RNA sequence: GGUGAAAUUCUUGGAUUUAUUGAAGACUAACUACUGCGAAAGCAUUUGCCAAGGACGUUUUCAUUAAUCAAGAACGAAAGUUAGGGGAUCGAAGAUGAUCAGAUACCGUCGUAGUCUUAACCAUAAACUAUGCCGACUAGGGAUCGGGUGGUGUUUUUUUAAUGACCCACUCGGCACCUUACGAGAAAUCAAAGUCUUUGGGUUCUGGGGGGAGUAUGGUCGCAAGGCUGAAACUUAAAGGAAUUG
């Protein structure tokens, strides 16, 4: 709530201990419940997977891409939104990107992002149609809602 | 056996341009356009610039070290004319006459296998 | 008999929003209410809770998909890109 | 032309023409009694193919169907029956 | 292409539509061959193979889901995977495999 | 005030092994200055010129073929094959009314690191006693060629580099293959290959260049 | 009642064709008018053919030709290009020269 | 004067008076 | 740069200009023709898949199933409109520099809508062969696209086989053309505008001097722009169409 892209509980398996540590990704578009979700250096380029940035080649869509080595999410985690890799950099190991503004970016191969768009795409293509609509929005956001306009106070 | 150059004649309705360079392309030697000799503006593509330029462009080529020179020829092409200068055959002349000797000449107008729209509306240019 | 004319489901609003937004609400409505077919068991059992997730009715399968459709159009183009640029690595 | 005979024309000046604008309208398309590389019996066939059509008793091919008349394949005689 | 043969083969011989008669018919021996199709899951793909692999029952994969097997098979609803059990007027065993 | 064109220090660029004579080009860059060594500089630039001119040949005066550097050795450099074309005026020439115009090509690999582009291309002449002026093609004829030409096309490379390739191509006896195997299917006429370019360039390679001396 | 009037006169075609604009002054128009002509010269001229066969390396050498075909607009043509206007009669005739 | 104006001079007086007559309705 | 000539304009805070690369849309050059398909509107790069269609072949089958058609209905250029994308050239508006007595027009330099595409609308065009459709019959002549038939024909491989490609003769279905008028027409022109005062092969639609007016009103479809249907009063001796001189 507060966040149109649904969200995708997924579980591995911990190296180091016996247990099922659970991760939580902003779910990509075309995913279901038991889709395994390969991860890492060597995983596949399929939908779904977090692949580092010198891997993949360009023209790719992936999402939810980080600014740099270990952040956890960072860039094009909005519903709809997404980056494409518009070529590398292979000396000094970075990646030219296509950030969902128009804007350009220079960040590091070892940057993982995940595969694919982000799901709930055209959200905003409906009107929000009545005042109440909107209040139930923002009442799970915060409160910047309603906006009385300075030149009447 | 001796050193070779090209000329790649860009001639236009209203400029003339014809600079010799090195071999490879990058490495130019004079430049001279039409309107640099003659100063009536008007006169940019005669045949009268076009051949005293011509020699102005093979007195400073003399001066570093060129015998003989292709002649490529070209237009402005693409969407516009399509058809050579009036001085590009008073530049060929006119540097076969002053020192050089002359290789090889083809063709290499920028000749689109269509493309865009012509510059001028479709009831077209009139007057 | 065939009860409206025109708005169809937008006509719970009734007189008000304007026109122009009541069509382009209805031109979603119908796909957000949309019984959609399963990829999986093949039958006409996918509806949505929330926009986002969708649900199989049989087979109890969840995927995530559009706001107010299943594959909305970049989606669909995205995962056809990625098929094609798989075949320049792999074969 | 002006003056002629329609009823008695020539046979030059009639298999020339269609099938159809003859007089008397009357096929092009004979009956043809194919000799088989395999069997030595005979094989009643007509002349256009239509179908692929294989031997009777030791099943290989025998005509192949084209835009017009049938086209038999390799060294096999025939008659006009 | 392969449509053109099941046609023929559901109204001459013999056959079978579901999933539990299929694996009955592979235990006993009747399979000729099974049809899978692409849609139906992986789990019962597997075992079906499993089973397929013991009577020696050649295996077939279908082009479209189960409401196309269905379309195929001359049938006004879905089927995951169709065996066979006795191919009649066609020649579909030695077509394919 | 400057005086900028002398103080460019003088070179000349050679032809590979596989043409005929290696002497060609004669051109300048610049001096090895204070940063931007000339050296690496040139590395990237080309020459379009004749085969006539390389080959000792005078008769093929069409084909202006390019010619990419890599190596340098003391302003005495040697090249390797870069691309192709046919003279503009040429295949004007071979244009005309009264034809079929067929043109088609296909992206072979080599043996290596080297992937391009090949353009051929074949015309329909008035067949040794035609009455009427055209003689045009049917249309599936045109494609039924353009596949049987793209299967040469295709089968004749995935050999030894530019090595082969370039061989092939100074006499093209690839036309032949394309004469008898089309001759049956339509008669045909001219036959040559219009252009050939580097989609995939070769990485550095100094093996196959400097292995190509006198 | 009820009155009223207008309409008028003929050529010939084929159905559609797309245009090609005038090589001079870039006006639109199609293939079936079109009026069309082949440039077709060396890019020496009388004069130049000398000097140069004088200052040439290369024994023959080549002296290629500059094609071209250009196309026309009617009003263009007449105001320069062959074209004119002829007879009653020299309008239906084809031959060029 | 021509037709084809003469169309343009009718169609913009039409859709006047379409106002003109819309402002009593 | 740019023209008839000038100017706007951008110019060593390297301009136009050659060579090496990249990015985006753009359109399928030349070949391309009294050439080809489609009911038209309209469609030209390669390759694949999806159905569809003509002609032709046919001692295949069906057996009057059909010809046109008020109502009603699919498609329907270009420009527009609706919300996304795409947004390079060309470019309604607009700004401009000239021109000129004036120029908000022609000529120039830029330039928002558009041109492109997604899903919707829109229904007009000199939507032109301003020539309804089906059927029959009448004059010659070649040339061509697509099958088909035959010929000890020529050409091409592996002399030879098979096809293809040609040549010849013929015949079906077309895009058309040349020559006469045998006829037709007010002529221009027409192989159909023919076979019609010696007036009738079947059928649909439209027109009845010009304007007023394709306006007004009323219906109807459309988000709108507009579309279809569609008068009146009143006015007027000619409008007009072909040719003929000048």
């Not at chain 3, 009734?14 to 609400?25: D, E, H, I, P």
């Not at chain 5, 061959?33 to 077939?60: C, G």
């Not at chain 5, 169709?82 to 579909?92: Q, R």
């Not at chain 7, 130049?48 to 290629?64: H, K, M, Q, T």
Request: aromatic letters at 6%; charged letters at 25%; glycine letters at 8%.
């Amino acid at each position: 709530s507060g966040r149109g892209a649904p969200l995708a509980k997924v579980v591995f398996r911990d190296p180091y201990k016996y247990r099922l540590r659970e991760e939580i990704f902003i779910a990509n578009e075309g995913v279901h419940t038991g889709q395994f979700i390969y991860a890492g250096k060597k995983a596949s380029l399929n939908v779904g997977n977090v692949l580092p940035l010198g891997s993949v080649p360009e023209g790719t869509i992936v999402s939810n891409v980080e600014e740099k080595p270990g952040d956890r999410g960072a860039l094009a985690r909005a519903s709809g939104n997404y980056v494409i890799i518009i070529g590398h950099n292979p000396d000094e190991n970075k990646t030219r990107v296509r950030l969902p503004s128009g804007a350009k970016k220079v960040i590091s191969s070892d940057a993982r992002g995940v595969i694919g768009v982000i799901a709930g795409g055209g959200r905003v293509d409906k009107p929000l149609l009545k005042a109440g609509r909107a209040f139930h929005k923002y009442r799970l956001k915060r409160n910047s809602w309603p906006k009385t306009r300075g030149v009447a106070m | 056996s001796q050193v070779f150059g090209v000329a790649r004649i860009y001639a236009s309705f209203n400029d003339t341009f014809v600079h010799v360079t090195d071999l490879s392309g990058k490495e130019t030697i004079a430049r001279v356009t039409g309107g640099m000799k003659v100063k009536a503006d008007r006169d940019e593509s005669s045949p009268y610039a076009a051949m005293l330029a011509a020699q102005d462009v093979a007195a400073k080529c003399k001066e570093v070290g060129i015998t003989a020179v292709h002649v490529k020829i070209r237009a402005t092409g693409g969407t516009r004319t399509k058809t050579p200068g009036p001085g590009g055959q008073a530049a060929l002349r006119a540097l076969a006459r002053s020192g050089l000797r002359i290789g090889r000449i083809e063709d290499v107008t920028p000749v689109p296998s269509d493309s865009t729209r012509k510059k001028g509306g479709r009831r077209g240019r009139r007057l | 008999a065939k009860r409206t004319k025109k708005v169809g489901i937008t006509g719970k609003y009734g007189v008000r929003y304007g026109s122009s937004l009541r069509r382009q609400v209805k031109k979603l409505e119908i796909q957000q209410h949309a019984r959609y077919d399963c990829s999986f068991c093949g039958k006409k059992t996918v509806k949505r809770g929330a926009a986002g997730i969708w649900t199989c009715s049989c087979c109890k399968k969840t995927v995530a998909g559009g706001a107010y459709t299943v594959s909305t159009a970049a989606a669909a183009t995205v995962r056809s890109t990625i098929r094609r640029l798989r075949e320049m690595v792999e074969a | 032309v002006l003056v002629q005979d329609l009823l008695h024309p020539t046979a030059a000046s009639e298999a020339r023409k269609h099938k159809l604008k003859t007089l008397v309208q009357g096929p092009r398309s004979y009956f043809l009694d194919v000799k088989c590389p395999g069997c030595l019996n005979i094989t009643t066939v007509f002349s256009h193919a239509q179908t692929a059509v294989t031997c009777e008793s030791c099943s290989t091919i025998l005509c192949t169907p084209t835009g017009g008349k049938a086209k038999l394949s390799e060294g096999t005689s025939f008659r006009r029956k | 292409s392969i449509n053109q043969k099941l046609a023929l083969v559901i109204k001459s011989g013999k056959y079978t539509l579901g999933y539990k008669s299929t694996v009955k018919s592979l235990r006993q021996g009747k399979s000729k061959l099974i049809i899978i199709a692409a849609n139906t899951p992986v789990l019962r793909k597997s075992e079906l193979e499993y089973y397929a692999m013991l009577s020696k029952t050649k295996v077939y994969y279908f082009q479209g889901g189960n409401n196309e097997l269905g379309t195929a098979v001359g049938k006004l609803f879905r089927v995951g995977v169709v065996s066979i059990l006795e191919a009649g007027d066609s020649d579909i065993l030695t077509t394919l495999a | 005030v400057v005086d900028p064109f002398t103080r460019k220090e003088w070179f000349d660029i050679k032809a590979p092994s596989t043409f005929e004579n290696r002497n060609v080009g004669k051109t300048l860059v610049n001096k090895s200055t204070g940063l931007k060594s000339a050296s690496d500089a040139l590395k990237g630039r080309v020459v379009e010129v004749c085969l006539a001119d390389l080959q000792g040949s005078e008769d093929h005066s069409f084909r202006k073929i390019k010619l990419r550097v890599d190596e340098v050795q003391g302003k005495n450099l040697l090249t390797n094959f870069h691309g192709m074309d046919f003279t503009t005026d040429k295949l004007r020439s071979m244009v005309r009314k009264w034809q079929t115009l067929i043109e088609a090509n296909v992206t072979v690999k080599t043996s290596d690191d080297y992937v391009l582009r090949i353009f051929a291309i074949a015309f329909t002449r008035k067949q040794a006693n035609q009455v009427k002026r055209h003689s045009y093609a049917q249309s599936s004829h045109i494609r039924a060629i353009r596949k049987v030409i793209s299967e040469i096309l295709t089968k004749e490379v995935q050999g030894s580099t530019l090595a082969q390739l370039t061989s092939k191509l100074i006499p093209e006896v690839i036309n032949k293959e394309i004469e008898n195997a089309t001759k049956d299917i339509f008669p045909l006429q001219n036959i040559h290959v219009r252009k050939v370019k580097l989609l995939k360039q070769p990485k550095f390679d100094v093996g196959a260049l400097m292995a190509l001396h006198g | 009642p009820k009155k009223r009037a207008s309409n008028g006169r003929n050529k010939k075609g084929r159905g559609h064709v797309k245009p090609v604009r005038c090589v001079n002054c870039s006006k639109s128009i199609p293939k079936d008018k079109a009026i069309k002509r082949m440039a077709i010269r060396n890019i020496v001229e009388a004069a130049a053919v000398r000097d140069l066969s004088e200052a040439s390396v290369y024994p023959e050498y080549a002296l290629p030709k500059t094609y071209n075909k250009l196309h026309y607009c009617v009003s263009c043509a007449i105001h320069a290009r062959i074209v004119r206007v002829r007879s009653r009669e020299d309008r239906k005739n084809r031959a060029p020269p | 004067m021509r037709a084809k104006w003469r169309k343009k001079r009718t169609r913009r007086l039409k859709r006047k008076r379409r106002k003109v007559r819309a402002r009593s309705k």
